[PDB]
Amino acid sequence: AKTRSSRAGLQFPVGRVHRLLRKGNYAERVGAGAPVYLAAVLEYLTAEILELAGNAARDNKKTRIIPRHLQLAVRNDEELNKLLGRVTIAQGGVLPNIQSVLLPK
């Protein structure tokens, strides 16, 4: 367990995040626990989105994930939609809905 990620039990790189924090002009100094905490949070969010995207892809009998599945996963979940409410996804489309008054009677 030489790499810091293996020590912390993560998949994302602790060292790269540390380097970016240092050479990003955020503070004079960076502590030793900020990269680990931030890498854990980023990995959690990525896994959370990918789970829903994979479920949506499996719903349509497809093996690979395309931007449509990412759009559907983000816009069907309340808090993921709230986080990314002002974000545009290329080739994502729109969520299918129709207002009631326009439906035939």
């Binding site: 002002r86 996804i89 129709i98 326009l102």
Partner: protein, 83 residues
């Protein structure tokens, strides 16, 4: 070559398809000019920032990251063309 009055290249059926994606069932005949004006204002607002970013770098081609930064500037983030 000189370019003039190319706004009408955004034809009526294109406007109607954009409206149908938005859920519109019935469209008035005066919508198309309004939409063209709105689009022209939006493009003029974004391209100015893009060209400013281009001119700062002493560069003669407008790249994708200039457009992405410009869109970020009006609070209109876009994913898929670089970060």
């Amino acid at each position: 070559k000189v370019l003039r009055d190319n706004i009408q290249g955004i034809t009526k059926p294109a406007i109607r398809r954009l409206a149908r994606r938005g859920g519109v069932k019935r469209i008035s005949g005066l919508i198309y000019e309004e939409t063209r004006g709105v689009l022209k204002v939006f493009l003029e607002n974004v391209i100015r920032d893009a060209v400013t970013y281009t001119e700062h770098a002493k560069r003669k081609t407008v790249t994708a990251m200039d457009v992405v930064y410009a869109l970020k500037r009006q609070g209109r983030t876009l994913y898929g063309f670089g970060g």
